[PDB]
């Protein structure tokens with residue numbers, strides 16, 4: 001039961017593979033059995049799904065028995081359990097769309113605390129862990145923070161969203177300041 | 182008729198795949214693109230496109246009926262019934278030499294010049310429960326449709342209105358009487374599937390079938406219109422039905438291209454809806470020319486000699 | 488109708504064994520129109536082999552079918568944990584199709600004598616006007632067992648019922664209950680109640696007993 | 702992939718009639734698949750009842766005149782469905798009824814021989830229990846004392862009852878026996894546990910009995 005993590009506003013590719021290398025019938029539906037998009041032999045059929053204008057596969061890979069389901073401009077709500085009915089197989093794959101967005105401007109005085117908010121889907125409990133330009137491995141499940149934003153933290157931060165053996169980077173820029181010298 | 186009881190499965194009928202492969206080869210020596218592009222991957226994601234450039238002779242591709250006679254050591258079995266699901270035990274089976282003359286018409290959404298349903302309108306489906314399996318409709322009374330390279334097709338608003346009814350009625354007669362039946366245009370996808378595509382005079386027509394599939398089990402659409410006129414368009418760059426890949430055919434030339442075909446059937450595909458209130462939405466479908474072939478071989482099955 | 492008589496009724500085997508189950512049809516079946524199924528306790532049967540020897544899609548190849556004269560046999564090589572349960576043969580040569588009586592394949596184990604216990608009716612049941620005497624046989628192998636009830640030394644017929652557990656998944660033993668039922672009236676009349684059990688593990692038939700009111 | 706989904710358990714009075722249903726997910730059309738119904742009485746082998754093949758129905762000698770078998774193709778809201786009607790139920794109709802499907806598309810297959818066939822897909826089964834008994838919650842009695850102790854769960858209808866010990870905290874050495882049907886037409890079962898004799902005055906043992914059809918739940922302490 002595969003699982004894929006994605007960043008809000010990014011493109012994710014839920015795979016789905018056929019046994020042999022042969023372009024055959026396949027179809028992408030979501031938990032509610034709503035058809036996302038399948039194929040009509042050599043043609044692509046897009047269904048009623050709200051992911052319509054953003055769903056899409058890879059014709060080229062169909063012959064290699066591969067029938068992905070690329071979702072672009074990924075939305076938190078796009079998070080779900082997309083089945084893939086192919087040759088009587090149901091490759092139900094999971095999709096989690098997280099979104100890390102700092103609050104106060106990237107520019108923040110020295111000492112003040114830095115608050116991070118992780119937008120996540122319901123029934124989802126990830127564990128984030130950013131890494132300061134120096135090394136602060138501070139942790140925060142859903143909402144992190146840097147108690148005292150030290151001037152040696154003013155730079156690129158490398159967070160991480162852990163959710164089922166997987167994780168997604170979220171590089172963020174932070175700027176510390178002064179009174180001045 | 183043959184005095185025996187046998188199993189049939191048009192959805193897993195092998196003649197379909199034997200004709201399909203034939204119809205494809207009937208296309209590689211009649212309609213040859215100026216360029217044909219096709220995916221070529223090792224599996225390593227990266228996929229080069231294999232290009233092929235050959236002569237592009239303008240030929241007025243006019244389909245000839247095709248028979249299918251069992252050779253030897255082989256026999257064709259035909260099923261007989263006014264309403265055959267085409268997937269089960271047939272009682273009035275009967276061995277035949279060749280299957281009726283079939284005109285391999287490649288198209289989407291509408292099945293042209295096929296074979297009408299003797300009794301009434303029949304709709305087969307490998308599983309009506311599965312909103313992913315094409316529903317093949319079989320008209321018992323065809324609806325003439327005339328297309329022209331001039332840019333459109335005319336259809337009888339009358340006949341088409343009736344048809345949607347005698348189809349809309351056969352639908353609920355399978356998904357639940359106390360269920361509203363609606364018809365909407367393609368959900369999305371390739372031009373060949375979203376519109377009623379097909380080939381006429383070797384020209385790939387792409388007719389917008391919105392006026393044919395926007396029927397609400399309530400109102401009409403015959404205000405100031407006697408005939409339905411689908412705004413059709415001929416394309417040169419098309420997605421191949423024979424295999425994933427585009428193909429460019431040379432522009433039109435004959436002073437006039439014209440078609441007058443019998444809408445003998447459709448290819449619908451209701452949307453899941455996730456068990457929502459009785460409001461099944463059926464839209465045009467097809468694109469998998471085999472369903473076509475199927476709609477013609479649904480009652481056949483070749484078998485080895487005993 | 489064609490009769491299928493299946494052989495043996497039960498057999499005991501170990502993981503990795505090869506096992507043979509046989510079925511004799513009351514008439515010849517030229518076409519080999521015979522099928523074999525497995526049924527595990529609580530579940531629907533599953534088709535394993537059809538036409539005498541053909542394996543259905545998805546069935547392990549350690550299963551095979553064979554025929555000689557009017558006899559048809561299922562063979563199981565390299566016996567596996569999921570294989571234990573009950574097997575049936577079926578002819579579909581002539582109408583109507585018919586099944587064998589079935590064969591139970593259970594796990595082989597060393598002999599283990601039952602631990603035997605006897606429970607007098609509770610005071611609460613006696614108060615509600617009935618009396619049930621219960622005898623328990625715990626964790627024994629093989630399954631074959633006899634228990635007889637005696638009251639005031641008199642063999643008891645037709646007023647008892649037995650219940651047996653499925654073979655235990657971990658120690659491969661069985662457990663069995665026997666319940667003697669009688670009116671509060673007769674219970675109060677007689678003095679000694681006895682459960683007599685006979686089993687291969689027991690060098691001699693064991694009797695557990697009590698005197699009413701001890 | 703074929704999944705056959707049968708209707709639920711029914712408890713029926715003698716003389717009554719019942720209809721059991723079978724939803725054939727994965728089955729295209731009964732024009733290509735035969736339906737065969739089969740039943741299994743408790744602790745018994747299997748017996749053929751009848752069929753629908755090529756839209757033609759029929760029943761075995763033992764059931765002819767008493768059984769109607771039908772099938773209809775459906776789509777969307779439902780898969781194709783077959784049903785079995787049985788009239789004038791008696792005690793010897795009590796059994797598990799299985800719906801069963803076999804493709805008839807390929808004449809050469811060997812699953813079938815002129816209408817007589819092997820059965821390639823099975824439903825879960827539906828229990829039809831034929832009885833005049835009315836629903837009734839059990840009495841629970843202690844079975845007082847390596848020692849053994851337990852609970853007698855007597856005189857209930859219909860099945861099932863469930864039994865745990867100490868709210869599930871005691872599971873090792875527990876044996877809960879299959880219910881037996883008494884002459885009164887009511888069920889009874891017992892549940893027993895073996896424990897070390899030493900803990901008998903130190904440890905508490907209670908059997909938790911649940912009979913949902915009568916909404917009955919009892920907790921019985923078992924004391925030496």
Ligand SMILES: *[C@@H]1O[C@H](CO)[C@@H](O)[C@H](O)[C@H]1NC(C)=O
Pocket residue numbers: 221228229
């Ligand atoms: C392109 O496709 C070819 C297959 O003919 C492959 O060998 C090559 O590595 C790919 N890369 C190029 C040349 O673009």
Ligand SMILES: *[C@@H]1O[C@H](CO)[C@@H](O)[C@H](O)[C@H]1NC(C)=O
Pocket residue numbers: 300301302303321322347348351
């Ligand atoms: C089938 O066709 C006949 C005429 O050929 C028509 O009268 C009948 O209503 C049709 N059945 C339907 C409504 O599908």
Ligand SMILES: *[C@@H]1O[C@H](CO)[C@@H](O)[C@H](O)[C@H]1NC(C)=O
Pocket residue numbers: 325326327335336337408441
């Ligand atoms: C289609 O053309 C035919 C002649 O081939 C004509 O009889 C028919 O009326 C036309 N159908 C239309 C335009 O509705």
Ligand SMILES: *[C@@H]1O[C@H](CO)[C@@H](O)[C@H](O)[C@H]1NC(C)=O
Pocket residue numbers: 359459
């Ligand atoms: C439709 O469902 C049943 C028929 O199965 C009918 O009795 C009922 O009145 C109708 N209800 C609805 C869905 O309007």
Ligand SMILES: *[C@@H]1O[C@H](CO)[C@@H](O)[C@H](O)[C@H]1NC(C)=O
Pocket residue numbers: 375376389390391392412
């Ligand atoms: C024709 O089809 C297009 C999409 O293919 C649709 O957006 C447009 O509204 C349609 N026009 C008509 C004839 O209603």
Ligand SMILES: *[C@@H]1O[C@H](CO)[C@@H](O)[C@H](O)[C@H]1NC(C)=O
Pocket residue numbers: 395396397400401402
């Ligand atoms: C279907 O209904 C919608 C809204 O009720 C309407 O706009 C549309 O024109 C109808 N389809 C036709 C043309 O019959």
Ligand SMILES: *[C@@H]1O[C@H](CO)[C@@H](O)[C@H](O)[C@H]1NC(C)=O
Pocket residue numbers: 338339403404406407408
């Ligand atoms: C609707 O229009 C058709 C022609 O397009 C005409 O035959 C029909 O009579 C009209 N409906 C009515 C009865 O006004």
Ligand SMILES: *[C@@H]1O[C@H](CO)[C@@H](O)[C@H](O)[C@H]1NC(C)=O
Pocket residue numbers: 323325326441442443
């Ligand atoms: C088939 O289509 C032609 C073209 O319009 C039509 O004139 C003819 O009557 C139709 N024949 C059939 C199949 O009824």
Ligand SMILES: *[C@@H]1O[C@H](CO)[C@@H](O)[C@H](O)[C@H]1NC(C)=O
Pocket residue numbers: 284286293294379380381382439440441442443
């Ligand atoms: C049969 O249908 C084809 C559609 O490809 C059409 O071109 C042809 O004209 C039809 N038959 C007739 C009447 O010529």
Ligand SMILES: *[C@@H]1O[C@H](CO)[C@@H](O)[C@H](O)[C@H]1NC(C)=O
Pocket residue numbers: 457458
């Ligand atoms: C069916 O209509 C809508 C479907 O979106 C649903 O909200 C409603 O509860 C259902 N019944 C009604 C109100 O018609």
Ligand SMILES: *[C@@H]1O[C@H](CO)[C@@H](O)[C@H](O)[C@H]1NC(C)=O
Pocket residue numbers: 716766767788789
């Ligand atoms: C049972 O059916 C028989 C014939 O099979 C009929 O004589 C009798 O009236 C039926 N019994 C009941 C209770 O309906």
Ligand SMILES: *[C@H]1O[C@H](CO)[C@@H](O)[C@H](O)[C@H]1NC(C)=O
Pocket residue numbers: 183184185186272273
């Ligand atoms: C044809 O009729 C004969 C009558 O003897 C019968 O044996 C055979 O089964 C029948 N075949 C069919 C149509 O089922």
Ligand SMILES: *[C@H]1O[C@H](CO)[C@@H](O)[C@H](O)[C@H]1NC(C)=O
Pocket residue numbers: 182261273
């Ligand atoms: C097939 O045989 C059946 C059985 O007699 C008969 O009812 C039916 O009309 C026949 N079908 C045809 C016309 O071939």
